[PDB]
Design a protein around this motif. Structure first.
Motif, short mmCIF file in Angstrom:
data_model
loop_
_atom_site.label_atom_id
_atom_site.label_comp_id
_atom_site.label_asym_id
_atom_site.label_seq_id
_atom_site.Cartn_x
_atom_site.Cartn_y
_atom_site.Cartn_z
N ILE A 365 0.86 -1.18 0.00
CA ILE A 365 0.00 0.00 0.00
C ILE A 365 0.89 1.23 0.00
O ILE A 365 1.87 1.30 0.76
CB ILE A 365 -0.94 0.01 1.22
CG1 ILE A 365 -2.08 -0.99 1.03
CG2 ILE A 365 -1.49 1.40 1.45
CD1 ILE A 365 -3.17 -0.50 0.12
N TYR A 392 -2.23 0.52 -4.88
CA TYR A 392 -2.36 -0.79 -4.26
C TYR A 392 -2.41 -1.86 -5.34
O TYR A 392 -2.57 -1.56 -6.52
CB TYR A 392 -3.61 -0.86 -3.38
CG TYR A 392 -4.90 -0.76 -4.17
CD1 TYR A 392 -5.48 0.47 -4.43
CD2 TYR A 392 -5.53 -1.90 -4.66
CE1 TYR A 392 -6.66 0.57 -5.15
CE2 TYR A 392 -6.71 -1.81 -5.38
CZ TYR A 392 -7.26 -0.58 -5.62
OH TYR A 392 -8.44 -0.49 -6.34
N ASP A 394 -4.42 -5.11 -6.79
CA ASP A 394 -5.80 -5.57 -6.80
C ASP A 394 -5.84 -7.09 -6.67
O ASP A 394 -4.83 -7.75 -6.43
CB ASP A 394 -6.50 -5.10 -8.07
CG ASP A 394 -5.99 -5.79 -9.32
OD1 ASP A 394 -5.03 -6.58 -9.23
OD2 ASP A 394 -6.56 -5.55 -10.41
N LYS A 400 -3.31 -0.62 -9.07
CA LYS A 400 -4.44 0.28 -9.28
C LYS A 400 -4.31 1.47 -8.34
O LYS A 400 -3.53 1.46 -7.38
CB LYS A 400 -5.77 -0.44 -9.07
CG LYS A 400 -6.13 -1.38 -10.21
CD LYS A 400 -7.50 -2.01 -10.00
CE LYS A 400 -7.87 -2.92 -11.16
NZ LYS A 400 -9.00 -3.83 -10.83
N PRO A 431 -8.55 -1.53 -0.22
CA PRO A 431 -8.77 -2.03 -1.58
C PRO A 431 -9.95 -2.99 -1.65
O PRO A 431 -9.84 -4.14 -1.23
CB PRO A 431 -7.45 -2.75 -1.91
CG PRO A 431 -6.81 -3.02 -0.59
CD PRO A 431 -7.19 -1.84 0.26
N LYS A 433 -11.34 -3.68 -4.59
CA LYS A 433 -11.07 -4.41 -5.83
C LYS A 433 -9.98 -5.44 -5.60
O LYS A 433 -9.19 -5.34 -4.66
CB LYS A 433 -10.67 -3.44 -6.94
CG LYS A 433 -11.78 -2.51 -7.38
CD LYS A 433 -11.30 -1.54 -8.44
CE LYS A 433 -12.42 -0.63 -8.92
NZ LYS A 433 -11.96 0.34 -9.95
#
Lengths: 433, 223, 223, 433
Positions: A365, A392, A394, A400, A431, A433
């Motif tokens: 992150i 981050y 995914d 992403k 996150p 996603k």
């Protein structure tokens, strides 16, 4: 009888014309129908009425408002800005400045006698009738002018140019005619030494200087200025509008009505030199469009708020709930996308993420804080607003980026900065996603 | 400053520093790394290996007082996270680029093609959503929006320029990047806002800043 | 050339032209319009009003032959429609910008952050889809894609640079705009293509072209 | 025993190492597993096998291919490019060049004797073992090399570097060992005067020069070159590969095997000077990535096709069907979005738009033709490809833009350029919005 073009308004075309039956020329501001916006027509109606009411040698006169295509035919003014003419002269003294202020005061006194407050006295609105020798000073542009009732004060809105705003307007107090006289004081000050009495890169501090009347007459340039000129400035730059000199009274101040007896005639080359720099800074800071620039410079107090905000966000990314409960008030409230439009209170809602997400595995992150803006609301209080960008990995393995906008309110409690409320919009900060 | 080795020893604080200490600093802060003193050599410098006879033993309270402030600033600026702060203290040169950029935007909003062709270079290139991923060249592509929409449509629009950043790349070249926020009235008469990101490259030719290339991403400037 | 008044009268064809005709041309092609001959004055020039005695009456077949070619080219180049032709004959200076741009793209594709930080200015700014309409500053934002994807993912990608256009804006500054076509393998192992449009501003600092700002529109470079 | 890093491959890291038991150093190209693409592994397998087969002093030798992480350990070569070393020397003559070509021919002869064709002989693949005085020339990089069967010719694909491609490859004829000898001819030519025998900004014309063998020995630089050197070049740059001198035969050419008797020893400063410019153009035109640049320069013949295409599009925008039927062949065929994937023939389908759309009212249309590319396919035939951008006013009154991609095929029929086929993809050309 049209001729040459002089310039452009937002919605209009300014062009030289003529009164053919009398061979007297004019300037025509074509209303047209380029736009006709709501408060655009309401203001134009106001400006035309006001300009129609004022007939004075030192005020740009309106001579018609035809609606053949609709017109705003004014006096032909070709002398340019007073401030530009002054820097071009070989000799410029207090007496020259007094003669100018006397005409400005005459125009302002005329406005006030007819129940009109200009509200935007500044160099750009001080024009010369022509390039001739003793061309008269003319007050121009009543686009912000208001109609007052006698001497009744009221809140007519926060309007004007920052450097010339009066203390009463900055205090959000009801105001009236005296605001023009405060502006005259700023203008006279500049006319004598060529720099403004109130200046600060930070607008909030500028307004604090104005409200406190915090100007002075620094040496050596003010040492050659007469006591009467200083006295008039002090009477114009009086914080209390009820004690501020009026246009009528200013016209009878010794520096004005006894110019030939008390005003110095010494050439002030340093004033001309400084005024040239003043005009150059003004033309360069015109701000043709609304320009917003995030605060780059930060006081130590504001840096403190950025630091503790970054410490809080670090505890989140590292899943340090001990640090989180140290920094956050036990009665913390929050709006956030994860809460689906509800206001949540306490720590429980946030502990769910510390227990089930903030200790991920090989999932890097990276948080970026963008354009933080800090308000100091007393010695022990602040709020901060910033963009929070999170990079981050995914689920499918790809990198992403997501964006949130965050407000955090800080109260110094028991000597420690603590977060009592925050508001997040945009994406969630874990996150999803 | 670093690349130029632009440091000095201002008075008064440096008036009481020994020449040997200034000498060692000079030999460490040598721009050319080939001529910079090495660790082995510095360990033999008189101020280091003959400290007893070379280094002053006077108390430097002004150094302690200043170090306190240095340390305090260092702990405040300690960025735990990547922090990106806008620009707000602009030189006169950078403000010049902001001004001509806003003059250009103003000419577009007012549909003044004469001003547009005055400010833009004849060989202007552009990436913009209106161009569908193509690089367009010249004034032709942009002439269409002036001759039609920019003056034909009678609705109020308000442009906002957010967080401009200006690169000065030589005395006669500059780059500006900014967010362009546009408030306008839609077909149903409802207020809307749109965002574009815009880069404009400027070249001072014949004493006038002129736009040789721009790149718009996001929304197209015509509502 | 026009702004410099950079014309001459090369031999042999101009050796047989009268001095008076060359004189009239000189007075018309005067850079300063205040000093340029007017229509009224030219009508009184000896070559015009005393043609019988001043103008040559020799046949200029080489002028006729050359005018035939001039006319033919003029009728071929007669653009009925706006035509935009790419650039393909690049100076050495412009090729230098193309080369360093491709070196930068290559470093990105190979996940070589050392080369990236060598070629990019430390104060680099960027608009890119990965940044969600924000202007990002420094190397931090881009470091994430190197430390992870650019080397982590093991799939073949092929980059194509289409129709580069280079503006030279001073001896040490340049601008390049190009389409970036990327072929790659998707998650299901199927071939895909994506397009970006990219502007890169270059400043020659310390003898090295360095990227101070870029603007990507279209697709994000990571598949 | 690893040490310093030398450079990067697409997938590999090159680093100096050592054979510790014998204190003999090497260069290690780490295979790794950065990618393992399909034809990436098929080629690497090929290159390793080939390099393993060739053991010759003038060829970079492979000494192992460990798969601990997988390795490609080669000879340590530190002399850089031959062409770079030559420009640094104080004296450089035909004799120096002959000594170089003799070594190159020895390496090429070795390859061919082992049934291997390099296919990519060029300056970048001609290295010096070290910076020492008489360091040997070494042939490098067999990434394009192929394995042939005896003397059998075959089509192994269109591969190589443009300036060095052989006529047989450009003719799409089966080829083999002789392609390396054509390349040697180009290389020798450059080694003598410092510029290539075949050069043209337009690649298609370059290939026409090569196929026609259209090179010459211009004065004055070639006037000092011996007849034997010219003779060897002519025998290498022989269009017919069956008549081209082989590596074996070239090794016994007087200029090679009688270098000490026929090769000039005069210093060729002009060659060194030109070679420096040649190396600089080469390093600048490296084309690190696939670069495509639309044809900006246009022959008069190609301009003719652009003109008639623009005349056709103008007739469309103006709705001049008479002009349209003059320019288009009566048997015109078309693919276009309006035809929904069908091939339409004749004029009827297109006449519908001339009758019902191409004469709109206050609806301005502006067409832009982008990056046209013209192929000339004989004196009376051409095709053109371009982006067609259309700016227009939509139904709701707003300006919009649409894109099409268009191919048009032209045949000169009865002395007039006529459009016999066109293909449009992307958006329709009539504003459907």
């Amino acid at each position: 009888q049209l001729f040459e073009e002089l310039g452009k308004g937002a919605f209009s075309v300014v062009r030289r014309c003529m009164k053919i039956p009398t061979g007297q020329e004019y300037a025509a501001k074509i209303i047209n129908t380029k736009k006709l916006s709501a408060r655009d027509h309401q203001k134009l109606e106001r400006e035309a009425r006001i300009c129609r009411l004022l007939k004075h040698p030192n005020i740009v006169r309106l001579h018609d408002s035809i609606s053949e295509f609709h017109y705003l035919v004014f006096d032909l003014v070709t002398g340019g800005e007073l401030f530009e003419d002054i820097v071009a002269r070989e000799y410029y003294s207090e007496a020259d400045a007094s003669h100018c202020i006397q005409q400005i005061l005459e125009s302002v006194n005329h406005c006030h006698l007819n129940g009109i407050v200009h509200r935007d006295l500044k160099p750009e609105n001080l024009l010369l009738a022509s390039k001739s020798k003793g061309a008269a000073v003319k007050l121009a542009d009543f686009g912000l002018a208001i109609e007052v009732q006698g001497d009744q004060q009221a809140w007519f809105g926060f309007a004007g140019t920052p450097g010339y705003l009066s203390p009463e307007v900055l205090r959000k107090d009801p105001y009236g005619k005296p605001v023009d006289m405060w502006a005259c004081g700023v203008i006279l000050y500049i006319l004598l030494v060529g720099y403004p009495p109130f200046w600060d890169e930070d607008q909030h501090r500028l307004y604090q200087q104005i409200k406190a009347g915090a100007y002075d007459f620094p040496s050596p340039e003010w040492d050659t200025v007469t006591p009467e000129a200083k006295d008039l400035i002090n009477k114009m730059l009086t914080i209390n509008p009820a004690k501020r000199i009026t246009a009528s009274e200013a016209l009878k101040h010794p520096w004005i009505c006894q110019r030939s007896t008390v005003a110095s005639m010494m050439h002030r080359q340093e004033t001309v030199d400084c005024l040239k720099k003043f005009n150059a800074r003004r033309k360069l800071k015109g701000a043709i469009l609304t320009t917003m620039l995030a605060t780059r410079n930060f006081s130590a107090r504001k840096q403190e708020i950025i630091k503790v905000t970054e410490q809080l966000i670090e505890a989140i990314n590292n899943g340090c709930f001990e640090a989180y409960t140290k920094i956050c008030d036990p009665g913390l409230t929050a709006f956030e996308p994860e809460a689906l439009g509800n206001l949540v209170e306490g720590m429980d809602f946030h502990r769910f993420y510390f227990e089930n997400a903030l200790s991920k595995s090989n999932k890097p992150i990276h948080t970026i804080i963008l354009n933080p803006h800090v308000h100091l609301v007393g010695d022990d209080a602040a709020c901060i607003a910033y963009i929070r960008l999170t990079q981050y990995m995914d689920g499918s393995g790809m990198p992403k980026t997501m964006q949130s906008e965050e407000t955090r309110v800080w109260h110094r409690r028991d000597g420690k900065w603590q977060n009592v409320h925050f508001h997040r919009s945009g994406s969630p900060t874990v996150p999803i996603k």
